[PDB]
Design a protein around this motif. Sequence first.
Motif, PDB file in Angstrom:
ATOM      1  N   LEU A 160     -10.325  -0.560   1.638  1.00  0.00           N
ATOM      2  CA  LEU A 160      -9.928  -1.625   0.709  1.00  0.00           C
ATOM      3  C   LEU A 160     -10.699  -2.914   0.959  1.00  0.00           C
ATOM      4  N   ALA A 194      -2.398   4.613   2.553  1.00  0.00           N
ATOM      5  CA  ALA A 194      -2.475   3.966   3.877  1.00  0.00           C
ATOM      6  C   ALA A 194      -3.522   4.561   4.846  1.00  0.00           C
ATOM      7  N   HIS A 206      -6.262  -1.405  -5.188  1.00  0.00           N
ATOM      8  CA  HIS A 206      -5.115  -0.566  -5.548  1.00  0.00           C
ATOM      9  C   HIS A 206      -4.026  -1.408  -6.217  1.00  0.00           C
ATOM     10  N   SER A 221      -6.807   2.957   4.158  1.00  0.00           N
ATOM     11  CA  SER A 221      -6.769   1.516   3.932  1.00  0.00           C
ATOM     12  C   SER A 221      -8.039   0.799   4.416  1.00  0.00           C
ATOM     13  N   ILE A 277      -6.635   4.892  -5.361  1.00  0.00           N
ATOM     14  CA  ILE A 277      -7.523   3.772  -5.040  1.00  0.00           C
ATOM     15  C   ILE A 277      -8.550   3.666  -6.179  1.00  0.00           C
ATOM     16  N   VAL A 312       0.835  -1.191   0.000  1.00  0.00           N
ATOM     17  CA  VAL A 312       0.000   0.000   0.000  1.00  0.00           C
ATOM     18  C   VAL A 312       0.884   1.260   0.000  1.00  0.00           C
TER      19      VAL A 312
END
Lengths: 153, 153
Positions: free
Chosen positions: A14, A8, A41, A11, A47, A3
């Motif tokens: 995700l 991050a 990603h 995150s 993203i 990542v």
Amino acid sequence: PPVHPFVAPLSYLLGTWRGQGEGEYPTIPSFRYGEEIRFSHSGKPVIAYTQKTWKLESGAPMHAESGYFRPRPDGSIEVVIAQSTGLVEVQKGTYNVDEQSIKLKSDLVGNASKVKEISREFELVDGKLSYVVRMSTTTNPLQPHLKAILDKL
Amino acid sequence: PPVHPFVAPLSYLLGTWRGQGEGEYPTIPSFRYGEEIRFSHSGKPVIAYTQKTWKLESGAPMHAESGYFRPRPDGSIEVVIAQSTGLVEVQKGTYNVDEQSIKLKSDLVGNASKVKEISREFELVDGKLSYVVRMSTTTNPLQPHLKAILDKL
């Protein structure tokens, strides 16, 4: 790939999400829908976002959209979206780490017959993804249009 | 779901494609890339488009884009695209059945620092998908930028 450091802080997005929502606006009758979203990603400061909706009872497909979220370490973010209906959006705003929220307003809405501005606001609430979409036209000021809550799969 | 009657004339696109391309422009040095495209549908008068590129030797990811193709029986078409770099495009033009070609020019390019117009032209050539992308800026007139040829998988 790992990542990216710019990704991050987001995150928590995700993965794949599924739930349901409701739509309404002065001119149209109110309606309900199912929704699925995937965030993914490839190691870049970006993203990927993909989404679809359907009719609740039958699962019959309704609409789809896709695009890209671009967060930066100062807390700013830009988002670009293309919709199956033939519209595009450039969204800009901010994200907040402590609140796990993202707040966006359109710089541009392209190829729309009536829509002028769109705002999109996301919040993680007890681990569920919630959003509100507001929309304006020339004669209807910015106001609620869509809202949904999705569980992480 | 069955293919919508508006999508049927472009059914030759449906599936996944992989190949390679080359990029160039006055300001940048020339480069090569691998490319993969998927076209899919859900029974609506819309084709979903998703694309990625990579470095040839390593397979290292480079960029991605996604959007929607909306053909109509008069031979007109509109295409909306969001790019991983943070741009959006509204493309309009025509498709030709006998030539298996699609010719598009931008109505709008959103959130770009330098790019003014983009044109995209596709042609099926001996069953392979070819395209050319041309681009302009304030000081560089519309001219070749990208070209690629992809095999159907």
